[PDB]
Design an enzyme around this catalytic site. Structure first.
Site, PDB file in Angstrom:
ATOM      1  N   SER A   1       0.862  -1.221   0.000  1.00  0.00           N
ATOM      2  CA  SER A   1       0.000   0.000   0.000  1.00  0.00           C
ATOM      3  C   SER A   1       0.901   1.277   0.000  1.00  0.00           C
ATOM      4  O   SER A   1       1.668   1.490  -0.997  1.00  0.00           O
ATOM      5  CB  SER A   1      -1.003  -0.069   1.208  1.00  0.00           C
ATOM      6  OG  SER A   1      -2.105   0.804   0.929  1.00  0.00           O
TER       7      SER A   1
ATOM      8  N   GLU B   1      -9.332  -5.920  -2.962  1.00  0.00           N
ATOM      9  CA  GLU B   1      -8.669  -4.731  -2.375  1.00  0.00           C
ATOM     10  C   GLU B   1      -9.673  -3.756  -1.744  1.00  0.00           C
ATOM     11  O   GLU B   1      -9.344  -3.149  -0.746  1.00  0.00           O
ATOM     12  CB  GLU B   1      -7.948  -3.944  -3.510  1.00  0.00           C
ATOM     13  CG  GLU B   1      -6.655  -4.677  -4.107  1.00  0.00           C
ATOM     14  CD  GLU B   1      -5.479  -4.655  -3.106  1.00  0.00           C
ATOM     15  OE1 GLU B   1      -5.582  -4.043  -1.986  1.00  0.00           O
ATOM     16  OE2 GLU B   1      -4.425  -5.264  -3.433  1.00  0.00           O
TER      17      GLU B   1
ATOM     18  N   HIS C   1      -7.433  -6.446   1.196  1.00  0.00           N
ATOM     19  CA  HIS C   1      -6.216  -5.617   1.199  1.00  0.00           C
ATOM     20  C   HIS C   1      -5.420  -5.911   2.482  1.00  0.00           C
ATOM     21  O   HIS C   1      -6.031  -5.928   3.586  1.00  0.00           O
ATOM     22  CB  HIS C   1      -6.707  -4.176   1.202  1.00  0.00           C
ATOM     23  CG  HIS C   1      -5.591  -3.179   1.327  1.00  0.00           C
ATOM     24  ND1 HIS C   1      -4.810  -2.808   0.252  1.00  0.00           N
ATOM     25  CD2 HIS C   1      -5.095  -2.528   2.403  1.00  0.00           C
ATOM     26  CE1 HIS C   1      -3.918  -1.895   0.651  1.00  0.00           C
ATOM     27  NE2 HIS C   1      -4.068  -1.719   1.954  1.00  0.00           N
TER      28      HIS C   1
END
Ligand SMILES: *[C@@H]1O[C@H](CO[C@H]2O[C@@H](C)[C@@H](O)[C@@H](O)[C@@H]2O)[C@@H](O[C@@H]2O[C@H](CO)[C@@H](O)[C@H](O)[C@H]2NC(C)=O)[C@H](O)[C@H]1NC(C)=O
Ligand SMILES: *[C@@H]1O[C@H](CO[C@H]2O[C@@H](C)[C@@H](O)[C@@H](O)[C@@H]2O)[C@@H](O[C@@H]2O[C@H](CO)[C@@H](O)[C@H](O)[C@H]2NC(C)=O)[C@H](O)[C@H]1NC(C)=O
Ligand SMILES: *[C@H]1O[C@H](CO[C@H]2O[C@@H](C)[C@@H](O)[C@@H](O)[C@@H]2O)[C@@H](O[C@@H]2O[C@H](CO)[C@@H](O)[C@H](O)[C@H]2NC(C)=O)[C@H](O)[C@H]1NC(C)=O
Ligand SMILES: *[C@H]1O[C@H](CO[C@H]2O[C@@H](C)[C@@H](O)[C@@H](O)[C@@H]2O)[C@@H](O[C@@H]2O[C@H](CO)[C@@H](O)[C@H](O)[C@H]2NC(C)=O)[C@H](O)[C@H]1NC(C)=O
Ligand SMILES: *[C@@H]1O[C@H](CO)[C@@H](O)[C@H](O)[C@H]1NC(C)=O
Ligand SMILES: *[C@@H]1O[C@H](CO)[C@@H](O)[C@H](O)[C@H]1NC(C)=O
Ligand SMILES: *[C@@H]1O[C@H](CO)[C@@H](O)[C@H](O)[C@H]1NC(C)=O
Ligand SMILES: *[C@@H]1O[C@H](CO)[C@@H](O)[C@H](O)[C@H]1NC(C)=O
Ligand SMILES: *[C@@H]1O[C@H](CO)[C@@H](O)[C@H](O)[C@H]1NC(C)=O
Ligand SMILES: *[C@@H]1O[C@H](CO)[C@@H](O)[C@H](O)[C@H]1NC(C)=O
Ligand SMILES: *[C@@H]1O[C@H](CO)[C@@H](O)[C@H](O)[C@H]1NC(C)=O
Ligand SMILES: *[C@@H]1O[C@H](CO)[C@@H](O)[C@H](O)[C@H]1NC(C)=O
Ligand SMILES: [Cl-]
Ligand SMILES: [Cl-]
Ligand SMILES: [Cl-]
Ligand SMILES: [Cl-]
Ligand SMILES: [K+]
Ligand code: NA
Ligand code: NA
EC number: 3.1.1.8
Lengths: 527, 527
Positions: free
Chosen positions: A196, A323, A436
């Protein structure tokens, strides 16, 4: 007793038993002057030297940051909160090395994500002792400043120039170049990896000329700097620094005076006001992040990427199947981690207003048009799934694919993966799927520990991912060569081959999210 | 009242209402002399002409055949049993045409499967009225002789030359060439399609010089003549005809006398003895099937295929995800349609002895070696699944893929599909998955009938398959061009692209069952 002589003085590590072997961990080595008092908001200054032995036998302070209190007592969110004391004095790094000490080992440097607002290197899921034990690599990770304290910008003013936390990362890379050989590492074989905002950070090191000689290659898990949350324009950055001054009583006519007044505030007053420097935010808001400062970043990064102005090397990039779902429970109406979150069309619409607040009515209708032409039964979950896909395609997957296309057009090998395994221990509900952040523990080898009740199929999956990542770092090629594995092909423009990662069977597929990405990449930026 | 003048005399059809429109069906038109008395076991003789109007308003007799009595009262097996009277007098065909009568419509000729031992054109799942209504094609289907009555061979003796049922199919193709224009059809646009032995039959029409000018292109669903059950050697064919004589009291010194004595037996005595002409059989035994007769088939078909001696045209070939599971409940120990059929290693081993009875111990161990290296947990169903895959890969999938590779190497376009949707109405249990035979009802458009309680997603899937199949017949290209569909790429050696068919999302994939097929195709034939 393991003592290593570094360029700044001696450090003492500790021995860990890992899978019938030993790993030496040096936790909490300082790599910069503590950025306190007059150093707050400046670039990190280099360390002076200690005489005596620095005891690197526990994780150091995490940097000041707001914490996620949306689900107190809940492991799914609490596992990402910081697990050491918060302090402005937080510029430290960790080194894990194999025992016996290796001769010239490849080095993996992890950069955590957290929106550039949160995160720390000491979380359990970033523990580098399994990779050191199993693959005989050295793993390094650093704390870097986050939020306004890391990223406040009055662009061109060296009192608050912006990008301080990226400069913290860079100084830790310099520290490895100068010191890692004393630990048995090879400074000429250093791979960055991050997830990320940690992945966006890694992609900006590919663009920054001062990082160019500090690493060899790069791994980007769920993030890249062309993602819409990753880089703040000069105009919103000055706006936000000025709003922060307003809210803390620090508005002044002279800009250097604004900074000096901000340096007198206690950290807590700064943290309390960060949420509010923006008139509306979303679950994905990055209020203080990377900017074009003319130093770390010399031009808008989309221009550098487009015109090939970046380090020429191999990359490994990928994303997880779901995600966007983690973000829906932080404000989209009708969603809850404690029920199946079936929403209506009206809820879906309100949900787009939550995630696309500055966007025109036409823009939001264009999203709905593109994602709600259903195939096909009147399934109750249609709108719940569409919202997770909107948020995950826009913010993570299409930008990772565009980054990989544009990078690979300049002649380097790139390898793309799609991670589609949901952990058997995941504490979030089934409808959130392969979320995610939940590939990380497979990358760091946590399912290799049989005592932890992952399945056997997950042990094998993690073992194969760990081998591919170590082969990529060591050799630039993320193959698993010994176990009749699917061969991972390079990702090229034209064919766009990627490899699926799952417990069942690995497949080579092409053109991930083709129709969706054409929407986000070629149409939506116009809106 | 619809009356059509054919070359043999007038025929009267009937009007059907289908989806708010009309279709004209002519069911049960004769296409050959009834093969009775002295004609039993000979090639079909052509029809003489009737004066007056033949009423083609009901399905005709099905050919004599044994019936599946393994599950009386059970729809899953009974739906494949014949639904008209059994008779040696069974050489008839069916024609469905759009109303109003079309001008030069493309023609689809269906050839049913059934191991060459069973089957009939009148089953519900082969009803051509939906294709005629929705795609405005003409659909034709024929009954052809099966079992010893269709395939008994004393090779080179015109009293029982072999391949009679393939010659029945061929004469029905000749009938369409001469008569279909009177129905509004184009004899220059005729596509054959068939499933299992019907698909193997279609592939042999590609090889037979007498079929070459009788059709334009070909569709092979789950079958091809290189499948291990599809063609009987000359040596086992003479052996089997001689065993049949022995069991019926018909052994003679003169071969023509054997045939004449077989012509005196009632059909039932012949049918009763067919199972036994072989010392052991399997659920997939084809006791009387196609042979190399020097007439229909001029040489071993593997030689013709390998050296490019076949009609040069486009083909559409595919298989279902769980081809082998249907066969396991007809004799493998531990299996049952009424429980989850978890078996042990010992059962798996006994199961290979059931399906590979003439095969060496080494050969059977080689199968077990190749299919039981598990990925990976100790899943209870490991051995149950491995057996279904052994049987489906060996008998259907690897031979369809090899046929398509070898055919396409001579320069023609081929398109391969993998069907992976399990019908929501399937009466067999879940562990059997996407079974052999259960794409047929999607091809013929049965889920287009909303009154039948298939899901909406199945209506859309069938509608898309029906369009691809009609486009392939009409234009040689099985695209669905109007609905942003995945484009179906040609299958080439080297890349081996195929299209997955499912209700969720259509994907282009490559190298179906690569590791398994290398085993069955390049190693197993040696054993
Ligand atoms: C799933 O939960 C949401 C979230 O809100 C709730 O959390 C639940 C598990 C329960 O404790 C509930 O009391 C709590 O409010 C539900 O949406 C909420 O619905 C309420 C009551 O109708 C609305 O007035 C709220 O504004 C709305 N909250 C939010 C944040 O949107 C949701 O309906 C429920 N969905 C189901 C059961 O399918
Ligand atoms: C699933 O069924 C098989 C099949 O045999 C049975 O059908 C069952 C549904 C039930 O009516 C049973 O009485 C009938 O015999 C079972 O295999 C059989 O097991 C028996 C009894 O132990 C053996 O002696 C048989 O030879 C064997 N039959 C065959 C054809 O192999 C099987 O064990 C059962 N499996 C389960 C429950 O997992
Ligand atoms: C940046 O500049 C102003 C700042 O306005 C803000 O005052 C700050 C101290 C802070 O509390 C912040 O929440 C507040 O919004 C922005 O002006 C906003 O614009 C809206 C209309 O959208 C008006 O209602 C107000 O002037 C103000 N907002 C609120 C909620 O009162 C300006 O939008 C922003 N610049 C950007 C986004 O580029
Ligand atoms: C074909 O020729 C013989 C035929 O033997 C058979 O006699 C028939 C009338 C019929 O009933 C059939 O079931 C019977 O098998 C085959 O000889 C067999 O070989 C086995 C050993 O495998 C011996 O036990 C017997 O001679 C006979 N079988 C039985 C069960 O009695 C021969 O195998 C076959 N040729 C092939 C397979 O190529
Ligand atoms: C460093 O380590 C050892 C503990 O084993 C100790 O003798 C030394 O004083 C330590 N330094 C500290 C606690 O500052
Ligand atoms: C480590 O390997 C590099 C090349 O990657 C080489 O230049 C260097 O001198 C090595 N050092 C050792 C083995 O100590
Ligand atoms: C503003 O104040 C600073 C802080 O002492 C001073 O150094 C600077 O010269 C002043 N700048 C301007 C532009 O007035
Ligand atoms: C390869 O397979 C062996 C045993 O067959 C296994 O123990 C090991 O985990 C595998 N290695 C990798 C790198 O996946
Ligand atoms: C053919 O059809 C009609 C029935 O409407 C009838 O008049 C004629 O006799 C029929 N021929 C038969 C039953 O043989
Ligand atoms: C049907 O079309 C063919 C070509 O496929 C042509 O040769 C033939 O004459 C046509 N007959 C018609 C329209 O009646
Ligand atoms: C055997 O009998 C047939 C049947 O009548 C006869 O026509 C034929 O000539 C005889 N053939 C041989 C080889 O003896
Ligand atoms: C194409 O889509 C339309 C409506 O959007 C639908 O009614 C039709 O079934 C589809 N046609 C095919 C050939 O799949
Ligand atoms: Cl609306
Ligand atoms: Cl493609
Ligand atoms: Cl054994
Ligand atoms: Cl491939
Ligand atoms: K072998
Ligand atoms: Na807490
Ligand atoms: Na019956």
């Amino acid at each position: 007793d393991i003592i290593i002589a570094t360029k700044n003085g001696k450090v003492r590590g500790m021995q860990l038993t890992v899978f019938g072997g030993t790993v030496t961990a040096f936790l909490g080595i300082p790599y910069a002057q503590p950025p306190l008092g007059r150093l707050r908001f400046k670039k990190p200054q280099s360390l002076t030297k200690w005489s005596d032995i620095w005891n690197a036998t526990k994780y150091a302070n995490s940097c000041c940051q707001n914490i996620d209190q949306s689900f107190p007592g809940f492991h799914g969110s609490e596992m990402w909160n910081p697990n050491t004391d918060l302090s402005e004095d937080c510029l430290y790094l960790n080194v894990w090395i194999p025992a016996p000490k290796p001769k010239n080992a490849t080095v993996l440097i992890w950069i955590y994500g957290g929106g550039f607002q949160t995160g720390t290197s000491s979380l359990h899921v970033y523990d580098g002792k399994f990779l050191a034990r199993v693959e005989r690599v050295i793993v390094v990770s650093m704390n870097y400043r986050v939020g306004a304290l890391g990223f406040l910008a009055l662009p061109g003013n060296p009192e608050a120039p912006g990008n301080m936390g990226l400069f913290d990362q860079q100084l830790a890379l310099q520290w490895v170049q100068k010191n890692i050989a004393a630990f048995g590492g090879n400074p000429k074989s250093v791979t960055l990896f991050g997830e990320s905002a940690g992945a966006a950070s890694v992609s900006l090191h590919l663009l920054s000329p001062g990082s160019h000689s500090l690493f060899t290659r790069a791994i980007l898990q769920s993030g890249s700097f062309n993602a819409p949350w990753a880089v703040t324009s000069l105009y919103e950055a000055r706006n936000r620094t000025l709003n922060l001054a307003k809210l803390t009583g620090c508005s002044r006519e002279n800009e250097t005076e604004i900074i000096k007044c901000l340096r007198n505030k206690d950290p807590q007053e700064i943290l309390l006001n960060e949420a509010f420097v923006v008139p509306y935010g979303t679950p994905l808001s990055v209020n203080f992040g990377p900017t074009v400062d003319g130093d770390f970043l010399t031009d808008m990064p989309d221009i550098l990427l487009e015109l090939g102005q970046f380090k020429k090397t191999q990359i490994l990039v990928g994303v997880n199947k779901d995600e966007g779902t983690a973000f829906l429970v932080y404000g989209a109406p009708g969603f809850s981690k404690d029920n199946n979150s079936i929403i209506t069309r009206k809820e879906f619409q309100e949900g787009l207003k939550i995630f696309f607040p500055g966007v025109s009515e036409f823009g939001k209708e264009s999203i709905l048009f593109h994602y709600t032409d259903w195939v096909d039964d009147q399934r109750p979950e249609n709108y719940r799934e569409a919202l997770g896909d909107v948020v995950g395609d826009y913010n993570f997957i299409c930008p990772a694919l565009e980054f990989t296309k544009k990078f690979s057009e300049w002649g380097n090998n790139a390898f793309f993966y799609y991670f589609e395994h949901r952990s058997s221990k995941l504490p979030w509900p089934e409808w959130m799927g392969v979320m995610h952040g939940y590939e990380i523990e497979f990358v760091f080898g946590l399912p290799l520990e049989r005592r932890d009740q992952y399945t056997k199929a997950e042990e094998i999956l993690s073992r194969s991912i760990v081998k591919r990542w170590a082969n990529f770092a060591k050799y630039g090629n993320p193959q698993e060569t010994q176990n009749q594995s699917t061969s991972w092909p390079v990702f090229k423009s034209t064919e766009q081959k990627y490899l699926t990662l799952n417990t069942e069977s690995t497949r080579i597929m092409t053109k991930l999210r083709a129709q969706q990405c054409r929407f986000w990449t070629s149409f939506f930026p116009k809106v």
